Design an enzyme around this catalytic site. Structure first.
Site, PDB file in Angstrom:
ATOM      1  N   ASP B  25      71.540   4.094   0.657  1.00  0.00           N
ATOM      2  CA  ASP B  25      72.861   3.585   1.921  1.00  0.00           C
ATOM      3  C   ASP B  25      72.630   3.569   3.002  1.00  0.00           C
ATOM      4  O   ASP B  25      71.506   3.246   3.890  1.00  0.00           O
ATOM      5  CB  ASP B  25      72.220   5.743   1.836  1.00  0.00           C
ATOM      6  CG  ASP B  25      72.694   5.937   3.057  1.00  0.00           C
ATOM      7  OD1 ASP B  25      73.808   5.449   3.633  1.00  0.00           O
ATOM      8  OD2 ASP B  25      73.259   7.893   3.287  1.00  0.00           O
ATOM      9  N   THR B  26      73.435   2.592   2.929  1.00  0.00           N
ATOM     10  CA  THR B  26      73.822   1.358   4.282  1.00  0.00           C
ATOM     11  C   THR B  26      73.965   1.940   5.610  1.00  0.00           C
ATOM     12  O   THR B  26      73.288   1.699   6.187  1.00  0.00           O
ATOM     13  CB  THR B  26      74.603  -0.047   4.666  1.00  0.00           C
ATOM     14  OG1 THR B  26      75.887   1.185   3.691  1.00  0.00           O
ATOM     15  CG2 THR B  26      74.411  -0.515   2.927  1.00  0.00           C
ATOM     16  N   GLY B  27      74.879   2.797   5.459  1.00  0.00           N
ATOM     17  CA  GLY B  27      74.752   4.009   6.499  1.00  0.00           C
ATOM     18  C   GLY B  27      73.061   4.603   7.066  1.00  0.00           C
ATOM     19  O   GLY B  27      73.110   5.270   8.536  1.00  0.00           O
TER      20      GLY B  27
END
Ligand SMILES: CC(C)CN(C[C@@H](O)[C@H](Cc1ccccc1)NC(=O)O[C@H]1CO[C@H]2OCC[C@H]21)S(=O)(=O)c1ccc(N)cc1
Ligand SMILES: [Cl-]
Ligand SMILES: [Cl-]
Ligand SMILES: [Cl-]
Ligand SMILES: [Cl-]
Ligand SMILES: [Cl-]
EC number: 3.4.23.16
Lengths: 99, 99
Positions: B25-27
């Protein structure tokens, strides 16, 4: 581009004639934008994250320019604390996670 | 690998000798996992996402393997709807976003 992850992967987007900052987010199934008007029909939906659910309006076939790359798809609008580009549009610009 | 985003970027992780599934999850700034037992002392943390906030247990210097890559770092444990690997550990496995 190659975007490292030392910082939040924030990009400029253009949507419904507005410039916004948004997070490139592989953890988001769909794109969700803070309250704004968009043209056309919508339908309600609930989405879930850390903290629980929020109610959003689902608009289909919306064009967004992401970091200068045009994509079209569903955009969710609602009370998100951050604008998020999700997988439904990341696929369209050819984004991949590499390690 | 090069991971496309047509499907959720789910990977196997190993933590406390147990295999689990988690979302890359880059967020997410931080790695957050469902309730489980971890060694040592923990410290308090509140994290805020789409639907409000949750309280979690912050464990530091935890050995964890992600998609076969070794990492040692902070794991937050609490009532997340899904296990998420955030940037703190994505950077340890050398992950970038590319388009
Ligand atoms: C939790 C994920 C499964 C889903 N989320 C995307 C996720 O990347 C969010 C995206 C995000 C980011 C900021 C605020 C709200 C949402 N990050 C997040 O909650 O991260 C938390 C852990 O690390 C901390 O750093 C960021 C907030 C904390 S989400 O924003 O809830 C969401 C869910 C569904 C859709 N369609 C779009 C977005
Ligand atoms: Cl497209
Ligand atoms: Cl779509
Ligand atoms: Cl592809
Ligand atoms: Cl992709
Ligand atoms: Cl860490």
């Amino acid at each position: 581009p190659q975007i490292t992850l030392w910082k939040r992967p924030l990009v400029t987007i253009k949507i419904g004639g507005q410039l916004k900052e948004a997070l490139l987010d592989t953890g988001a199934d769909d794109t969700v934008i803070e309250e704004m008007s968009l043209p056309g029909r919508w339908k309600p939906k609930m989405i879930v994250g850390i903290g629980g659910f929020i109610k959003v309006r689902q608009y289909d076939q919306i064009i967004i320019e992401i970091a200068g790359h045009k994509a079209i798809g569903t955009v969710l609008v609602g009370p998100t604390p951050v604008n998020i580009i999700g997988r439904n549009l990341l696929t369209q610009i050819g984004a991949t996670l590499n390690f």
